mmCIF file of C-alpha atoms in Angstrom:
data_model
loop_
_atom_site.group_PDB
_atom_site.id
_atom_site.type_symbol
_atom_site.label_atom_id
_atom_site.label_comp_id
_atom_site.label_asym_id
_atom_site.label_seq_id
_atom_site.Cartn_x
_atom_site.Cartn_y
_atom_site.Cartn_z
ATOM 1 C CA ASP A 294 -24.485 -1.245 24.899
ATOM 2 C CA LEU A 295 -22.739 -4.156 23.480
ATOM 3 C CA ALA A 296 -23.791 -3.628 19.666
ATOM 4 C CA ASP A 297 -22.668 -0.191 20.118
ATOM 5 C CA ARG A 298 -19.132 -0.939 21.182
ATOM 6 C CA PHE A 299 -19.123 -3.530 18.247
ATOM 7 C CA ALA A 300 -19.888 -0.705 16.135
ATOM 8 C CA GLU A 301 -17.301 1.652 17.160
ATOM 9 C CA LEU A 302 -14.717 -1.273 16.811
ATOM 10 C CA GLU A 303 -15.619 -1.471 13.336
ATOM 11 C CA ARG A 304 -15.123 2.157 12.979
ATOM 12 C CA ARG A 305 -11.705 1.830 14.906
ATOM 13 C CA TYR A 306 -10.202 -0.702 12.531
ATOM 14 C CA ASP A 307 -12.012 -0.184 9.192
ATOM 15 C CA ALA A 308 -13.576 -3.472 9.368
ATOM 16 C CA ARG A 309 -16.675 -5.844 9.216
ATOM 17 C CA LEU A 310 -17.166 -7.618 12.403
ATOM 18 C CA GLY A 311 -19.161 -10.940 13.290
ATOM 19 C CA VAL A 312 -19.851 -12.152 16.810
ATOM 20 C CA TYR A 313 -21.714 -14.966 18.414
ATOM 21 C CA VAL A 314 -22.128 -16.638 21.668
ATOM 22 C CA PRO A 315 -24.886 -19.221 22.249
ATOM 23 C CA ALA A 316 -27.406 -18.946 24.700
ATOM 24 C CA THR A 317 -26.938 -20.828 28.014
ATOM 25 C CA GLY A 318 -28.347 -21.370 31.320
ATOM 26 C CA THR A 319 -28.777 -17.714 32.270
ATOM 27 C CA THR A 320 -27.284 -15.784 29.264
ATOM 28 C CA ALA A 321 -28.720 -14.734 26.164
ATOM 29 C CA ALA A 322 -26.945 -15.452 22.716
ATOM 30 C CA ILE A 323 -24.668 -12.273 22.002
ATOM 31 C CA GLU A 324 -25.140 -11.859 18.391
ATOM 32 C CA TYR A 325 -23.761 -9.044 16.177
ATOM 33 C CA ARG A 326 -23.881 -9.461 12.148
ATOM 34 C CA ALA A 327 -23.990 -13.491 13.339
ATOM 35 C CA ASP A 328 -25.641 -14.720 10.447
ATOM 36 C CA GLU A 329 -23.369 -12.737 7.552
ATOM 37 C CA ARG A 330 -21.062 -14.919 6.015
ATOM 38 C CA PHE A 331 -17.231 -14.538 6.692
ATOM 39 C CA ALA A 332 -14.860 -16.572 5.430
ATOM 40 C CA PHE A 333 -14.042 -19.655 7.013
ATOM 41 C CA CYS A 334 -10.003 -19.316 6.811
ATOM 42 C CA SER A 335 -8.069 -21.835 8.926
ATOM 43 C CA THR A 336 -11.201 -21.981 11.319
ATOM 44 C CA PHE A 337 -12.477 -24.855 9.185
ATOM 45 C CA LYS A 338 -9.713 -27.038 10.829
ATOM 46 C CA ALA A 339 -11.218 -27.608 13.911
ATOM 47 C CA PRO A 340 -13.927 -29.595 12.284
ATOM 48 C CA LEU A 341 -12.129 -30.722 9.762
ATOM 49 C CA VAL A 342 -9.772 -32.805 12.428
ATOM 50 C CA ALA A 343 -13.548 -33.627 14.038
ATOM 51 C CA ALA A 344 -14.351 -35.060 10.512
ATOM 52 C CA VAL A 345 -11.270 -37.383 10.159
ATOM 53 C CA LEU A 346 -11.494 -38.174 13.807
ATOM 54 C CA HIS A 347 -14.879 -39.378 13.624
ATOM 55 C CA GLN A 348 -14.645 -41.305 10.359
ATOM 56 C CA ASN A 349 -11.710 -43.645 11.454
ATOM 57 C CA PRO A 350 -10.843 -45.810 14.308
ATOM 58 C CA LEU A 351 -8.776 -44.349 16.895
ATOM 59 C CA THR A 352 -5.369 -45.896 16.028
ATOM 60 C CA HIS A 353 -5.556 -44.387 12.302
ATOM 61 C CA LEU A 354 -3.739 -41.480 14.089
ATOM 62 C CA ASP A 355 -0.813 -43.853 13.680
ATOM 63 C CA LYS A 356 -1.087 -44.251 9.650
ATOM 64 C CA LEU A 357 1.905 -42.652 8.118
ATOM 65 C CA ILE A 358 1.208 -40.076 5.156
ATOM 66 C CA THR A 359 3.948 -39.122 2.641
ATOM 67 C CA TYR A 360 3.951 -36.330 0.635
ATOM 68 C CA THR A 361 6.158 -34.258 -1.924
ATOM 69 C CA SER A 362 7.689 -31.021 -2.529
ATOM 70 C CA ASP A 363 4.619 -30.058 -4.757
ATOM 71 C CA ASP A 364 2.257 -30.615 -1.892
ATOM 72 C CA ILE A 365 3.911 -27.676 -0.062
ATOM 73 C CA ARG A 366 1.452 -24.857 -1.178
ATOM 74 C CA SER A 367 0.886 -22.336 1.784
ATOM 75 C CA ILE A 368 2.084 -21.608 5.283
ATOM 76 C CA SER A 369 3.054 -25.261 6.793
ATOM 77 C CA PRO A 370 5.406 -25.148 9.548
ATOM 78 C CA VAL A 371 5.231 -28.386 10.815
ATOM 79 C CA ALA A 372 4.753 -30.091 7.453
ATOM 80 C CA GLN A 373 7.777 -28.125 5.544
ATOM 81 C CA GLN A 374 9.885 -29.861 8.645
ATOM 82 C CA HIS A 375 8.488 -33.105 8.131
ATOM 83 C CA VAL A 376 8.621 -33.549 4.319
ATOM 84 C CA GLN A 377 11.425 -35.939 4.043
ATOM 85 C CA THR A 378 9.667 -38.431 6.768
ATOM 86 C CA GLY A 379 5.959 -38.350 6.093
ATOM 87 C CA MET A 380 3.614 -37.633 9.094
ATOM 88 C CA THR A 381 1.091 -39.415 10.765
ATOM 89 C CA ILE A 382 -2.673 -38.378 10.865
ATOM 90 C CA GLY A 383 -2.343 -37.722 14.561
ATOM 91 C CA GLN A 384 0.598 -35.338 13.727
ATOM 92 C CA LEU A 385 -1.139 -33.785 10.771
ATOM 93 C CA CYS A 386 -4.345 -33.329 12.973
ATOM 94 C CA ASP A 387 -1.636 -31.688 15.397
ATOM 95 C CA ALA A 388 -0.247 -29.161 13.004
ATOM 96 C CA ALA A 389 -3.524 -28.499 11.504
ATOM 97 C CA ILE A 390 -5.055 -27.493 14.687
ATOM 98 C CA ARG A 391 -1.735 -25.880 16.790
ATOM 99 C CA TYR A 392 0.272 -24.355 13.765
ATOM 100 C CA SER A 393 -2.743 -23.913 11.343
ATOM 101 C CA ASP A 394 -0.661 -25.784 9.222
ATOM 102 C CA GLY A 395 -2.012 -25.350 5.347
ATOM 103 C CA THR A 396 -0.254 -28.429 3.925
ATOM 104 C CA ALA A 397 -1.643 -30.849 7.053
ATOM 105 C CA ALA A 398 -4.941 -29.577 6.256
ATOM 106 C CA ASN A 399 -4.928 -30.599 2.530
ATOM 107 C CA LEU A 400 -3.276 -33.721 3.613
ATOM 108 C CA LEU A 401 -6.508 -34.432 6.221
ATOM 109 C CA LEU A 402 -9.133 -33.159 3.259
ATOM 110 C CA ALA A 403 -7.519 -35.809 0.917
ATOM 111 C CA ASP A 404 -7.739 -38.484 3.797
ATOM 112 C CA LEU A 405 -11.531 -37.736 3.907
ATOM 113 C CA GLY A 406 -11.756 -38.066 0.424
ATOM 114 C CA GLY A 407 -13.826 -37.803 -2.084
ATOM 115 C CA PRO A 408 -15.029 -34.953 -4.913
ATOM 116 C CA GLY A 409 -13.405 -31.267 -4.617
ATOM 117 C CA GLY A 410 -10.102 -33.264 -2.957
ATOM 118 C CA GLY A 411 -12.115 -33.985 0.413
ATOM 119 C CA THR A 412 -13.910 -30.336 0.337
ATOM 120 C CA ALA A 413 -17.529 -32.056 -0.687
ATOM 121 C CA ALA A 414 -17.100 -34.640 2.108
ATOM 122 C CA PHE A 415 -16.065 -31.784 4.490
ATOM 123 C CA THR A 416 -19.115 -29.983 3.998
ATOM 124 C CA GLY A 417 -21.319 -32.948 4.438
ATOM 125 C CA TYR A 418 -19.845 -33.826 7.504
ATOM 126 C CA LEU A 419 -21.083 -30.412 8.704
ATOM 127 C CA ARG A 420 -24.423 -30.972 7.009
ATOM 128 C CA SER A 421 -24.477 -34.071 9.279
ATOM 129 C CA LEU A 422 -24.255 -31.835 12.525
ATOM 130 C CA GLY A 423 -27.281 -29.222 11.336
ATOM 131 C CA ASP A 424 -25.055 -26.623 9.606
ATOM 132 C CA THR A 425 -27.174 -26.009 6.460
ATOM 133 C CA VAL A 426 -24.949 -22.717 6.190
ATOM 134 C CA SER A 427 -21.491 -23.414 5.855
ATOM 135 C CA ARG A 428 -19.251 -24.403 2.785
ATOM 136 C CA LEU A 429 -15.890 -25.468 1.907
ATOM 137 C CA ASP A 430 -15.137 -25.085 -1.999
ATOM 138 C CA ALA A 431 -11.337 -24.914 -1.944
ATOM 139 C CA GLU A 432 -7.881 -25.979 -0.138
ATOM 140 C CA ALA A 433 -5.001 -24.063 1.125
ATOM 141 C CA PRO A 434 -4.043 -21.595 -0.399
ATOM 142 C CA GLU A 435 -7.338 -20.896 -2.422
ATOM 143 C CA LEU A 436 -9.666 -20.773 0.030
ATOM 144 C CA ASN A 437 -8.311 -17.770 1.876
ATOM 145 C CA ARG A 438 -8.858 -15.557 -1.213
ATOM 146 C CA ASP A 439 -12.098 -15.243 -2.428
ATOM 147 C CA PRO A 440 -13.476 -11.894 -2.817
ATOM 148 C CA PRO A 441 -15.131 -10.124 0.102
ATOM 149 C CA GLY A 442 -19.360 -11.222 -0.757
ATOM 150 C CA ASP A 443 -18.452 -14.270 -1.922
ATOM 151 C CA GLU A 444 -19.899 -17.317 -0.757
ATOM 152 C CA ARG A 445 -17.487 -19.701 -1.605
ATOM 153 C CA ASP A 446 -15.344 -21.176 1.742
ATOM 154 C CA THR A 447 -17.693 -19.240 4.329
ATOM 155 C CA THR A 448 -19.240 -19.956 7.355
ATOM 156 C CA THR A 449 -21.108 -17.456 10.000
ATOM 157 C CA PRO A 450 -20.250 -16.809 13.454
ATOM 158 C CA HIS A 451 -23.467 -18.347 14.364
ATOM 159 C CA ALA A 452 -23.008 -21.430 12.262
ATOM 160 C CA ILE A 453 -19.745 -21.967 13.065
ATOM 161 C CA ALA A 454 -20.183 -21.542 16.859
ATOM 162 C CA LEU A 455 -23.178 -24.431 17.041
ATOM 163 C CA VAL A 456 -20.654 -26.407 15.175
ATOM 164 C CA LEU A 457 -17.974 -26.035 17.901
ATOM 165 C CA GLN A 458 -20.519 -26.203 20.679
ATOM 166 C CA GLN A 459 -21.488 -29.832 19.344
ATOM 167 C CA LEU A 460 -17.990 -30.937 18.935
ATOM 168 C CA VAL A 461 -16.580 -29.685 22.334
ATOM 169 C CA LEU A 462 -19.659 -29.312 24.439
ATOM 170 C CA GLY A 463 -22.427 -32.055 22.957
ATOM 171 C CA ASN A 464 -22.064 -35.519 21.912
ATOM 172 C CA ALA A 465 -20.650 -35.087 17.916
ATOM 173 C CA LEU A 466 -17.755 -37.073 19.054
ATOM 174 C CA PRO A 467 -17.572 -40.272 21.234
ATOM 175 C CA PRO A 468 -15.446 -38.983 24.506
ATOM 176 C CA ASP A 469 -12.395 -40.216 23.104
ATOM 177 C CA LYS A 470 -12.143 -38.498 20.487
ATOM 178 C CA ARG A 471 -13.725 -35.307 21.904
ATOM 179 C CA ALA A 472 -10.829 -35.232 24.361
ATOM 180 C CA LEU A 473 -8.204 -35.361 21.299
ATOM 181 C CA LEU A 474 -10.156 -32.296 19.689
ATOM 182 C CA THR A 475 -10.110 -30.386 22.883
ATOM 183 C CA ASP A 476 -6.546 -31.008 24.051
ATOM 184 C CA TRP A 477 -5.097 -29.726 20.647
ATOM 185 C CA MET A 478 -7.313 -26.794 20.522
ATOM 186 C CA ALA A 479 -5.930 -26.153 24.306
ATOM 187 C CA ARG A 480 -2.546 -26.501 23.158
ATOM 188 C CA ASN A 481 -3.112 -24.060 20.450
ATOM 189 C CA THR A 482 0.006 -21.975 19.601
ATOM 190 C CA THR A 483 -1.394 -19.297 17.350
ATOM 191 C CA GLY A 484 -4.543 -17.594 19.200
ATOM 192 C CA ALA A 485 -2.648 -15.737 21.947
ATOM 193 C CA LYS A 486 -3.686 -12.242 20.976
ATOM 194 C CA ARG A 487 -7.152 -13.049 20.134
ATOM 195 C CA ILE A 488 -10.128 -14.589 22.260
ATOM 196 C CA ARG A 489 -7.359 -15.562 24.952
ATOM 197 C CA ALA A 490 -6.060 -11.974 24.953
ATOM 198 C CA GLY A 491 -9.840 -10.847 26.027
ATOM 199 C CA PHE A 492 -10.512 -13.338 28.610
ATOM 200 C CA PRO A 493 -8.972 -13.511 32.275
ATOM 201 C CA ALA A 494 -6.238 -15.579 33.170
ATOM 202 C CA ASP A 495 -8.245 -17.428 35.449
ATOM 203 C CA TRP A 496 -10.749 -18.398 32.376
ATOM 204 C CA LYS A 497 -9.592 -21.782 30.397
ATOM 205 C CA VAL A 498 -9.666 -20.841 26.593
ATOM 206 C CA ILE A 499 -9.168 -23.202 24.087
ATOM 207 C CA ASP A 500 -9.448 -21.959 20.499
ATOM 208 C CA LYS A 501 -8.877 -22.281 16.658
ATOM 209 C CA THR A 502 -7.623 -18.803 14.722
ATOM 210 C CA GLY A 503 -7.748 -17.953 11.085
ATOM 211 C CA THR A 504 -6.337 -15.368 9.093
ATOM 212 C CA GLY A 505 -6.856 -14.577 5.416
ATOM 213 C CA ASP A 506 -6.446 -12.066 2.267
ATOM 214 C CA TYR A 507 -8.483 -8.773 2.963
ATOM 215 C CA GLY A 508 -7.566 -8.216 6.491
ATOM 216 C CA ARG A 509 -9.443 -11.375 7.314
ATOM 217 C CA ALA A 510 -8.780 -12.282 10.879
ATOM 218 C CA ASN A 511 -11.063 -14.987 12.468
ATOM 219 C CA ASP A 512 -11.053 -16.927 16.301
ATOM 220 C CA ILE A 513 -13.274 -19.438 17.600
ATOM 221 C CA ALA A 514 -12.953 -20.763 20.961
ATOM 222 C CA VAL A 515 -14.692 -22.449 23.971
ATOM 223 C CA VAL A 516 -13.836 -20.705 27.308
ATOM 224 C CA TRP A 517 -14.660 -21.828 30.805
ATOM 225 C CA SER A 518 -15.217 -19.460 33.630
ATOM 226 C CA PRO A 519 -13.123 -20.353 36.960
ATOM 227 C CA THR A 520 -16.318 -22.203 38.360
ATOM 228 C CA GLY A 521 -16.362 -24.441 35.251
ATOM 229 C CA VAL A 522 -19.198 -22.827 32.843
ATOM 230 C CA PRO A 523 -18.387 -23.234 29.420
ATOM 231 C CA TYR A 524 -19.498 -20.696 26.597
ATOM 232 C CA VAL A 525 -18.832 -21.075 22.970
ATOM 233 C CA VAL A 526 -17.039 -17.871 21.257
ATOM 234 C CA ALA A 527 -17.189 -17.158 17.635
ATOM 235 C CA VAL A 528 -15.288 -14.003 16.575
ATOM 236 C CA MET A 529 -14.882 -13.198 12.794
ATOM 237 C CA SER A 530 -13.205 -9.879 10.642
ATOM 238 C CA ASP A 531 -12.461 -8.446 7.588
ATOM 239 C CA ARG A 532 -11.482 -5.640 6.053
ATOM 240 C CA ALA A 533 -12.311 -4.991 2.574
ATOM 241 C CA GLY A 534 -11.948 -1.594 2.287
ATOM 242 C CA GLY A 535 -8.320 -2.345 2.178
ATOM 243 C CA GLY A 536 -8.421 -4.317 -1.020
ATOM 244 C CA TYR A 537 -6.428 -7.744 -0.609
ATOM 245 C CA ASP A 538 -3.532 -6.615 1.078
ATOM 246 C CA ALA A 539 -5.520 -5.343 4.120
ATOM 247 C CA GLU A 540 -3.642 -6.055 7.274
ATOM 248 C CA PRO A 541 -5.600 -8.561 9.320
ATOM 249 C CA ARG A 542 -5.942 -7.018 12.877
ATOM 250 C CA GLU A 543 -6.105 -8.949 15.788
ATOM 251 C CA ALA A 544 -6.428 -6.486 18.214
ATOM 252 C CA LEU A 545 -9.939 -6.038 17.065
ATOM 253 C CA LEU A 546 -10.758 -9.857 18.086
ATOM 254 C CA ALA A 547 -8.966 -9.079 21.291
ATOM 255 C CA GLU A 548 -11.171 -5.905 22.331
ATOM 256 C CA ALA A 549 -13.950 -7.615 20.726
ATOM 257 C CA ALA A 550 -13.401 -10.513 23.169
ATOM 258 C CA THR A 551 -12.650 -8.435 25.971
ATOM 259 C CA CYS A 552 -16.290 -6.919 25.418
ATOM 260 C CA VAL A 553 -18.279 -10.414 25.434
ATOM 261 C CA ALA A 554 -16.011 -11.198 28.808
ATOM 262 C CA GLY A 555 -17.077 -8.471 30.065
ATOM 263 C CA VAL A 556 -21.053 -9.253 29.968
ATOM 264 C CA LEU A 557 -19.849 -12.918 30.849
ATOM 265 C CA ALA A 558 -18.183 -12.094 34.105
#
């Protein structure tokens, strides 16, 4: 039994696990703690890039953004390397998705603009997709730090799966912008040990990870079977019992995804 397997994983990793896979043609929704709140961590960067793409002509990708030493406030593998030159909006989107670059995401939030350094507009974009649950309140590094149970900077597996479904499979974005987001997620460098590890090699996986304090580890993905049938997979986890410095456990997400893959095969 699937719920029993997920509960076993929670005990193994001293964790809270949330899983959602939306219903399809012939599969029922898979849900486990799917309506409980979990921190977004970096998973918000997928709809953030969608928001920025949607808001602007495609050639806004070519606009150069400059930034300074005091803008590097978080893990930023790309933005740290390019600080002496600036980065284009396209480069920022690439870094935000594929390297989970914190500075890149903060700069994209500022590009979206408005109150809260762009967080209010980001949340408004989610509202436009029918998501009345999620909320973004802070940028990096603060957004990964809210205490367990706090609702700031949270989504739910259910909510973010429905958002990702509209972005990648549905018509939230025009096809050209949809393809840009899809390709960046396809080329992600940070997800090999999460949902990807749970699906056989002949399934296509695109994803966006997130990792935070209190042992937070998330992954959101779109997967395609060897015959081209797509599923959206959201897996979220935290380890409040280990406190602020609890280690995130990717293996929990790999095992959860393996259980999901077993059902979808």
